[PDB]
Write an enzyme that holds these catalytic residues in place. Structure first.
Site, PDB file in Angstrom:
ATOM      1  N   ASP A  45       0.847  -1.192   0.000  1.00  0.00           N
ATOM      2  CA  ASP A  45       0.000   0.000   0.000  1.00  0.00           C
ATOM      3  C   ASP A  45       0.885   1.244   0.000  1.00  0.00           C
ATOM      4  O   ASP A  45       2.014   1.216  -0.513  1.00  0.00           O
ATOM      5  CB  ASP A  45      -0.959  -0.083   1.204  1.00  0.00           C
ATOM      6  CG  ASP A  45      -2.312   0.568   0.958  1.00  0.00           C
ATOM      7  OD1 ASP A  45      -2.344   1.750   0.567  1.00  0.00           O
ATOM      8  OD2 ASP A  45      -3.356  -0.108   1.180  1.00  0.00           O
ATOM      9  N   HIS A  70      -3.878   5.730   3.578  1.00  0.00           N
ATOM     10  CA  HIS A  70      -4.565   4.501   3.215  1.00  0.00           C
ATOM     11  C   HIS A  70      -3.875   3.275   3.803  1.00  0.00           C
ATOM     12  O   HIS A  70      -4.517   2.421   4.425  1.00  0.00           O
ATOM     13  CB  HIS A  70      -4.602   4.448   1.689  1.00  0.00           C
ATOM     14  CG  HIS A  70      -5.491   3.389   1.148  1.00  0.00           C
ATOM     15  ND1 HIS A  70      -5.044   2.120   0.869  1.00  0.00           N
ATOM     16  CD2 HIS A  70      -6.803   3.406   0.825  1.00  0.00           C
ATOM     17  CE1 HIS A  70      -6.042   1.388   0.413  1.00  0.00           C
ATOM     18  NE2 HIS A  70      -7.122   2.150   0.376  1.00  0.00           N
ATOM     19  N   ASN A  89     -14.130  -0.996  -6.492  1.00  0.00           N
ATOM     20  CA  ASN A  89     -15.203  -0.107  -6.085  1.00  0.00           C
ATOM     21  C   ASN A  89     -16.005   0.409  -7.264  1.00  0.00           C
ATOM     22  O   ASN A  89     -16.483   1.541  -7.236  1.00  0.00           O
ATOM     23  CB  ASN A  89     -14.656   1.088  -5.316  1.00  0.00           C
ATOM     24  CG  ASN A  89     -13.837   0.681  -4.137  1.00  0.00           C
ATOM     25  OD1 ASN A  89     -14.089  -0.310  -3.463  1.00  0.00           O
ATOM     26  ND2 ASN A  89     -12.858   1.466  -3.872  1.00  0.00           N
ATOM     27  N   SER A  95     -11.135  -1.720  -0.165  1.00  0.00           N
ATOM     28  CA  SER A  95      -9.757  -1.767   0.322  1.00  0.00           C
ATOM     29  C   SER A  95      -9.815  -1.722   1.869  1.00  0.00           C
ATOM     30  O   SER A  95      -8.769  -2.014   2.499  1.00  0.00           O
ATOM     31  CB  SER A  95      -8.922  -0.835  -0.556  1.00  0.00           C
TER      32      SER A  95
END
Ligand SMILES: [Ca+2]
Ligand SMILES: [Ca+2]
Length: 274
Positions: free
Chosen positions: A32, A63, A154, A220
């Site tokens: 990430d 994130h 998404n 996520s």
């Protein structure tokens, strides 16, 4: 005081933790935007960066720190609580502070995780497009015994279109969709033949830089619940193959409807770890 985010009881991770299985001695890599390793509610024990000029133990986006906290926020009297709070947590920076990165850097991160003996890879990332190198990297990780988990995407649904992103769409990767605190599928959750299981993804509260906590929405946020669940299972059953861990998660999931929209349903890590 410590808060238990709703996702932990929803997947029954609290029940497994109460048995004494918390992820100890299981290695989980979060691929990430880095992890804020100095956060008081995280313990990042190693990692690697494949983003030029960025260290893996800093997170200028947020994130990666949030995803990491869903896996592994420490069990104490502070902050929040991860699914698998005793895991050995690794920050593999493959996205920059803007949330993007080269696909070759993502491949390097997957390869690093495999070479360094990670038990679980979480990729709360992806896009509409894959590549041969990405497929080879995840295939090799899985073949070498790593449980590979990724956000399904998404992109929602539209007719019968298959909107699963990459790397979730690869057969070596568990594609994770998102539910909310009522256990209803989130409208943004991608759909298609490769969708495998669902986990909490809407309104997920977790660690966030700097030394704080925040609420995010996305598949996520769902992926690290499944990565953490895999680590709980392995901490109780350390001899399982990656396929055996994966099948425990899908075969004991709570049916939510057609697999195109829900996969096998909501993970139940208590049932999976029986
Ligand atoms: Ca905590
Ligand atoms: Ca993906």
């Amino acid at each position: 005081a410590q808060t238990v985010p709703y996702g932990i009881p929803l997947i029954k991770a609290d029940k497994v933790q109460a048995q004494g299985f918390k992820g100890a001695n299981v290695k989980v890599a979060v691929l990430d935007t880095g992890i804020q390793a100095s956060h008081p509610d995280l313990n990042v024990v190693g990692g690697a960066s494949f983003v030029a000029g960025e260290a893996y133990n800093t997170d200028g986006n947020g994130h990666g720190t949030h995803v990491a906290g869903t896996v592994a926020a420490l069990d104490n009297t502070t902050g929040v609580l991860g699914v698998a709070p005793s895991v050995s947590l690794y920050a593999v920076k493959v996205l920059n502070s803007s949330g993007s990165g080269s696909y070759s850097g993502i491949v390097s991160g997957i390869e690093w995780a495999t070479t360094n003996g990670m038990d679980v890879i979480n990729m709360s990332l992806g896009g509409a497009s894959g590549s041969t190198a990405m497929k080879q990297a995840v295939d090799n990780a899985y073949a070498r015994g790593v449980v590979v988990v990724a956000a399904a995407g998404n992109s929602g649904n539209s007719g019968s279109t298959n909107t699963i992103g990459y790397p979730a769409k690869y057969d070596s990767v568990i594609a994770v969709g998102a539910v909310d605190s009522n256990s209803n599928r989130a409208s943004f959750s991608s759909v298609g033949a490769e969708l495998e299981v669902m986990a909490p993804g809407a309104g997920v509260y977790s660690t966030y830089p700097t030394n704080t906590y925040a609420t995010l929405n996305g598949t996520s946020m769902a992926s690290p619940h499944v990565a953490g669940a895999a680590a709980l299972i392995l901490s109780k059953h350390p001899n399982l193959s990656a396929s055996q861990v994966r099948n425990r998660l899908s075969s004991t999931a709570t049916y939510l409807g057609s697999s195109f929209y829900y996969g096998k349903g909501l993970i139940n890590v208590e049932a999976a770890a029986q």
